[PDB]
């Protein structure tokens with residue numbers, strides 16, 4: 527059933543996943559010396575290319591591949607259009623490894639055909655709380671604690687093959703070359719997410735969406751007018767009213783994040799993320815990189831009253847090309863990123879996220895039901911969407927966990 531995935535160090539079935547009681551590696555321990563410096567073989571008409579994702583023109587080349595060939599819905603209505611600025615931000619965090627950005631080009635004429643990207647992340651990925659309890663009950667705490675220390679691993683994203691080259695087994699070769707490049711740097715695990723079901727997720731969460739500009743969303747067929755609104759003389763007027771928001775934030779002391787807020791934001795974020803089984807550990811340099819505002823890319827606000835930062839939220843922008851329509855070329859989506867609340871309930875903090883996003887011209891706010899995202903769904907009028915984000919590890923056995931025990935946001 528899976529000619530490629532059956533050959534890789536990942537759990538092969540749900541049944542297998544059920545037998546997993548401790549975090550730890552799947553594969554033989556190996557060393558960098560066991561990995562060849564010769565690149566993985568590829569047919570003679572293609573070549574590997576390493577783009578420089580800090581250089582405008584190479585970012586632009588990858589940007590066009592993704593704009594024309596990346597994730598789309600099944601009815602070919604919308605295709606993600608991650609911006610050039612977004613790609614530089616997502617792919618070049620502190621201490622990134624340029625060799626982990628991997629492309630394939632056609633050799634004759636240098637046409638770009640495929641891409642995959644890894645970035646470093648320090649992740650807590652030790653045995654989860656409910657399974658450490660089971661271990662204590664069996665006298666197996668030593669084995670369950672073996673890999674408690676946060677690990678320096680790889681996060682994979684942006685795998686893309688050109689539409690003309692689909693179903694030719696190019697994605698497996700991309701994945702094996704990426705694995706070689708990561709292994710050459712003495713890293714042996716990865717974390718990745720996808721919408722599709724592959725062998726075998728350790729967690730799965732549904733997507734949720736919150737309408738900000740319902741008239742546009744109905745026009746482009748992202749949304750429909752629900753049946754119940756047909757009982758009204760003006761269904762659209764009533765739908766707009768339903769999703770109406772304040773025109774300015776409600777929380778006293780809300781302001782954009784600045785560099786001097788980095789230590790306090792790191793403190794409150796790391797205290798909060800510690801409560802979840804799987805989550806990142808960020809340095810001050812990483813907090814700066816992933817959270818300081820960047821025009822068109824990431825938006826972050828702190829609540830500061832009386833000279834103390836007590837809460838914050840962040841969101842990032844992913845537009846989509848509107849493939850079929852005549853009034854509109856883009857869908858502008860805001861995605862909930864990291865946050866932490868110590869002074870106000872989460873629903874009150876995230877209402878200000880929706881207000882700022884609407885003010886800035888976003889059409890919808892989306893999120894996965896990770897973190898405590900379920901805690902404000904109903905009051906803030908999010909609804910569940912037809913999509914899931916499945917969380918996977920490469921070369922790491924891991925017990926199934928609930929999505930509310932995952933604290934890693936993937937872009």
Ligand SMILES: CCCCCCCCCCCCCC(=O)SCCNC(=O)CCNC(=O)[C@H](O)C(C)(C)COP(=O)(O)OP(=O)(O)OC[C@H]1O[C@@H](n2cnc3c(N)ncnc32)[C@H](O)[C@@H]1OP(=O)(O)O
Pocket residue numbers: 527528529530531532595596597598680682683684685686687688691692693694695696697698701704705708709713714715716718719720721722724920921
């Ligand atoms: C230690 C370091 C390790 C580093 C590596 C860690 C692993 C990282 C793994 C990658 C994490 C990526 C995270 C993201 O970026 S998720 C976003 C993925 N990108 C897209 O959906 C964009 C649009 N689609 C495409 O570009 C292509 O359809 C892709 C490239 C996805 C497949 O190309 P194509 O359709 O032309 O197929 P093929 O003939 O070449 O290959 C077929 C094989 O590919 C398996 N397949 C299909 N989709 C995925 C998928 N999303 N993850 C993993 N495997 C996938 C499939 O089951 C089959 O294997 P098997 O069923 O026969 O066994």
Ligand SMILES: CN(C)CCCN(C)c1nc(N(C)CCC#N)c2sc(C(C)(C)C)cc2n1
Pocket residue numbers: 597598599600603604605606721722747748749846847912913
């Ligand atoms: C196996 N599949 C296709 C699960 C499909 C999940 N994906 C990739 C996906 N993607 C989507 N987008 C790309 C929307 C934002 C953009 N781009 C959408 S937009 C959508 C409606 C809101 C129109 C129903 C469903 C949907 N589904």
Ligand SMILES: CN(C)CCCN(C)c1nc(N(C)CCC#N)c2sc(C(C)(C)C)cc2n1
Pocket residue numbers: 597606683684719720721722733734735844892893911912913914915936937
């Ligand atoms: C690697 N990564 C983390 C790919 C995040 C892509 N994104 C941005 C994404 N993805 C979606 N998927 C179903 C996962 C597709 C994949 N991969 C959806 S489904 C959705 C609704 C329209 C239902 C709200 C928004 C949305 N957004």
Ligand SMILES: [Mg+2]
Pocket residue numbers: 687691692693694695696697
């Ligand atoms: Mg292919």
